[PDB]
Structure formats: C-alpha cells, structure tokens
Amino acid sequence: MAEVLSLVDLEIPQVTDKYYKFDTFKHLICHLFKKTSTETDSNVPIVIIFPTTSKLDNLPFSDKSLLIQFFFTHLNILMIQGEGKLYQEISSAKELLTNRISRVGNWTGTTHFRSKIAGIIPTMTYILNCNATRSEIATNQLIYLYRLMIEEINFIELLQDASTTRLSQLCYAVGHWSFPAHNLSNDDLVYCVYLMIDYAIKQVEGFDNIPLNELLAFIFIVRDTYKNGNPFHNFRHAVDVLQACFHFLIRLGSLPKFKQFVEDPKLDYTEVHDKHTVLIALKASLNPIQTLGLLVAALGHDVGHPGTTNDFMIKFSAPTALLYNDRSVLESYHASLFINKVLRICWPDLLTCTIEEKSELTIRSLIISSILATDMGEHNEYVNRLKSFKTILNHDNTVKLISALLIKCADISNVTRPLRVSAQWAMVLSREFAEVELLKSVIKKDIDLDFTKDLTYDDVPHELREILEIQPDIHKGQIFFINLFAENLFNSVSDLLPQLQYTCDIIMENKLFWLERAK
C-alpha cells in the first residue's frame, strides 16, 4: 500500500509495500529530492516514521515536520512518530493516487464525487492558501531550513550522471536552437537550468555570484513544483521555455554568445562535447537584471500546472477557477505559487530588486506580469498592445511589454523548433489533451475507468517517421495552431525585433511540411 521511510526500527507491515530505513534525516531528504528525477507521478502514499553533528539530523521534530510539509508537499506524505485511522487514511490515499486521471481530478478539485484529501494529498487551493497566509516567522524558519540544506546537502551528487562528458554535452545541448528536450532526463534538465541561470547571473554587475550548490538547491525546489507525470506541462517544458528565452536574449544581444552556442538555428541536434562543463562567454532592449528576471519567469511560468487547461477549469467549476473568477486561472496560480512558495523562500532578494536604479518596478512585479502574459486567452490583447506600441509607453511598461512578448514566444516556441523536435512536442501535447478529454468523460460519467491501474506511455520516438506513424493527423493540430496563433505572433514580434526572424523562417518551413502531408 505505502512506501515507508523510517528513521527508527518500527515496522507497520499492515500498510507497507516497500520499506526504506535511513541512518540520517539528511539521507531521507536526499531520497525525497530524487523522486522528481523520473517521468512518472509518485502514485503511492509515503509514510515517514520519526522517533518519539549534522544540524539537519538534530532538528527538533517541529522543524523536521515543517521541512517535510513545505518542501515535500508534492509527495503525498503522512508523518508519524510511534492502526485503524492510519490504515484507512493510507488505503484511501492509495485508491485516489494510483491512477493519473484520479490524480489530476484530486489536484484540480474536479472529482469530489470520488485541507489535504485524506489528510495526505495536496490540492491546488490548499497549496495556494498555505503560501498566501504563511506568517513572517514561518517564512524565516523555512529560509533557515533551506539554507541548512544548502550547507549540508551536496546537490550535484543527487544527479545520476554528473560526469565531465555529460555536463559538457549539456552545454552544447543548451547551445542548440534544436534543443533536444525529450532526450534529456529531469536530472539533465536541472543542470541545464544551472548553466543558463548561472550564465545570466554572471552578467549582472551589482550582484554577487551564487555557488553551484546554492543554485542547484533552488533548481531542485523548482523541479519539485512541476508534476512529472504531465506529458507536456512538466519541468521539461519549463526548461525548454527557459532555453528558448535564453536563445532569444542571446540573439537580441542581452546576453553574450558562448563557445558552445550553435549559430545556425535550423540545424538538428548533434551530440557534441569538449573539456568545458559550463558555458564559456565570448544597447539591448533588456538590461542584465531584466534579462535574469525574464529567464527566472520562464523557469517558473507553469509551476504546479495540473495537466489541464483554463477552459477545462472554467467549464467544470474547478475551485481555482472560482477563486480567480475565470480570469487567467492557471497563470494566476503559477504566479502566486512561484513567487510565494519558491522565490520568497529561495531567492527573496531577487524579488526586491528593481528593473533599474531609477525604477520602482520590482523584479517580483515583472515576473508576475510576464507569467500572466502566457495566458493564451489574452493572446489578442498582447498582440494589439504590440501593434499600438510599434505605432506610447514609459520605460517600465516598455520593459513589461517586451518581456511579455518574449515569454509568450518562448512558451509556444515548439512550433518554431526544427521539424523533428517540433513533432515530438506535438505528440506529448496530444497525450496531455487526450488525458483532459478522459478526465472530462469521467466527471460527466461517460466512462468508467479502472482506478487500480495507472496510465503509462512508450517513449517519444526519436525519428519523425515513427511519430507520424504513431499518430497521423498530427498535422491538423499544427496547422490550426500556426494559422490562428503562432504565425501572427512571431511575425509581429520579429517586425519589432528583427534578430528573431529565424523563428518565422522555421514556422513556415514546418507549416509547408504539415500542409504537404495534409494532402
């Protein structure tokens, strides 16, 4: 029934599937951080058994509990410290967690018929509320626990392959416009984020450089807010959007080029490496701090995404849709979580920076603005505000608009990647859409699923041919989306920012191919 993690000799075989005994709280924590390295949602309840030199290991139970509750909320944990109430709680949680469609229903609050659910499973409203109402004292204690983990956990060791060869490969992967996101593990992707954010931080003048371990801790925490079982809106998508923004900013001159940068965006990915394990560097619209703010916003722009759409949340009266009055439902959620859960604890000093010495506009506000701009329901207004701007805004609102436009472009950049990679994204987006349709049918009682089994997928094919064979008609989704959203956005942005014209070039190349096989 449950995965049991113990710091003591007690056994609870009545509810135990697999039991892990840990010598230290630090090693238990490391086990938990690695759970988001996989491609699947954790689908079993986790019981942690506590007792009735390391600072982590010697924390009072109140602080150990606070750490687990806050940093590992996503893992469906029940904490005990030495039968009927336990068994029923775990049994109920297991019944609700096993199946993907059940999990999405739980998180979104749309399958009530089927606080934390069973005291264990978090919902979007629970997490949103917890982070909005947290006291100053609680906030400072979490900051202390975070710094404690940075002090005592060597995060590079939590990646499966941190060899010199692999790290160099990732530098070159980051350098390709044909970013091979689907060939990178969630561990690989963590290092990719480090490469890009570290590179950006180094360009910011009045701003200290942050050690490898501290950046990695932050990124592990970000990864932990994405749902690994989302076929599309997962940490891979976050890093991909970050990487697209990264390329945009390099090509606009907001960041310098680096030795591993691949100049020609139309090339497919080739696996390259050398002896370097970080990016080696060689007026712009956005200055160094705005550039960093944008990249950070891209990283966090879908945090906590439950694998649905605004339309689903609105039409099925999801609690978060009710909170947000149907207005930018998921994006409001992402912005609130990213700021109040992640950045407030992990990087509070970034939130209080301003976009320039003269400006009162904070990086917090810029991040919020940019994240909110990714709502496709507001797509037309950002396009019109761009066309009005091209034909006036003060500096602050100019920075907001440019940032908004770049993050919008990055968010839907899968259609501007070279065909093969673009097709892989199309396929996983189709998987997620199919899950949403299944969830709707479950809620409407148009289908009865076996909730004792989980949804599993074969790997995304490497080659375009196999993708087209697995689902022909991929073309019509791409044609629809390019005609109604992408073409107009990238053309308009490239008119303002000529360096991004290559995006329009690739879109057309892809469109012509999709139109070809429509015939």
- Sequence-separated (6 or more) residues with CB below 8 Å from residue 279: 171, 174, 175, 195, 196, 198, 199, 258, 259, 260
Residue 411 binds Zn ion (CB under 5 A)? yes
| 72 secondary structure, DSSP code | T
| Lookup result for tokens 């109430």 | 85
Residues that bind Mg ion (CB under 5 A): 302, 374
| Contact by Cβ (8 Å): 310, 200 | no
- Cα dihedral across residues 110, 115, 120, 125: positive or negative: positive
DSSP 241-288: HHHHHHHHHHHTTSS--BTT--S-TTSPP-----S-SS--B---SS-H
> Out of 376, 419, 438, 508, which residue is the one contacting ligand IBM (CB under 6 A)?
376
Give the nearest distance from C-beta 117 to Zn ion in angstroms: 26
Choice between 288 and 300, CB closer to Mg ion: 300
Residue 481 binds ligand IBM (CB under 6 A)? yes
Residue 436 binds ligand IBM (CB under 6 A)? no
> Which residues does residue 47 pair with via DSSP β-bridges, in sequence order?
4, 78
How many residues at the interface with ligand IBM, by CB under 6 A? 10
- Closest CB to ligand IBM belongs to which residue? 481
> Residue 5: which H helix or E strand, with range?
strand 2-6
> Out of 188, 302, 396, 432, which residue is the one contacting Zn ion (CB under 5 A)?
302
Give the nearest distance from C-beta 478 to ligand IBM in angstroms: 6
Is 237 annotated in a binding site? The answer is yes
Is 9 annotated in a binding site? The answer is no
Is 450 annotated in a binding site? The answer is no
Residue 435 binds Zn ion (CB under 5 A)? no
- Cα dihedral across residues 226, 230, 236, 241: positive or negative: negative
Segment interacting with ligand IBM, rule: CB under 6 A, options 48-56, 315-323, 325-333, 477-485? 477-485
Residue 414 binds ligand IBM (CB under 6 A)? yes
| Contact by Cβ (8 Å): 103, 97 | yes
Quote the tokens at residue 512. Answer: 């012509």
Q: Where are the alpha helices (DSSP H) in 341-394?
A: 344-346, 348-352, 363-372, 379-390
The CA distance from 352 to 364, in Å, is: 7
> Out of 426, 489, 504, 507, which residue is the one contacting ligand IBM (CB under 6 A)?
426
Quote the tokens at residue 12. Answer: 């609870």
> Out of 412, 460, 474, 504, which residue is the one contacting ligand IBM (CB under 6 A)?
412
Is 198 annotated in a binding site? The answer is no
- Of Zn ion, Mg ion, ligand IBM, none, which one sits near residue 336, judging by CB under 5 to 8 A according to partner kind? none
- Of ligand IBM, Mg ion, Zn ion, none, which one sits near residue 414, judging by CB under 5 to 8 A according to partner kind? ligand IBM
Residue 234 binds ligand IBM (CB under 6 A)? no
Segment interacting with Zn ion, rule: CB under 5 A, options 140-148, 185-193, 407-415, 421-429? 407-415
The CA distance from 441 to 419, in Å, is: 33
- Of Zn ion, ligand IBM, Mg ion, none, which one sits near residue 321, judging by CB under 5 to 8 A according to partner kind? none
**Nearest alpha carbon to residue 331 among 300, 295, 374:** 374
Quote the tokens at residue 264. Answer: 């020609």
Residue 308 binds ligand IBM (CB under 6 A)? no
Choice between 152 and 311, CB closer to ligand IBM: 311
Choice between 389 and 481, CB closer to ligand IBM: 481
> Out of 42, 186, 291, 309, which residue is the one contacting ligand IBM (CB under 6 A)?
309
The CA distance from 427 to 231, in Å, is: 9
Cite the annotated binding site for Mg(2+) by residue number: 302
Where do contacts with ligand IBM occur on this chain (CB under 6 A)?
309, 376, 412, 414-415, 426, 429, 477-478, 481
Cite the annotated binding site for Zn(2+) by residue number: 237, 301-302, 411
Where do contacts with Zn ion occur on this chain (CB under 5 A)?
302, 411
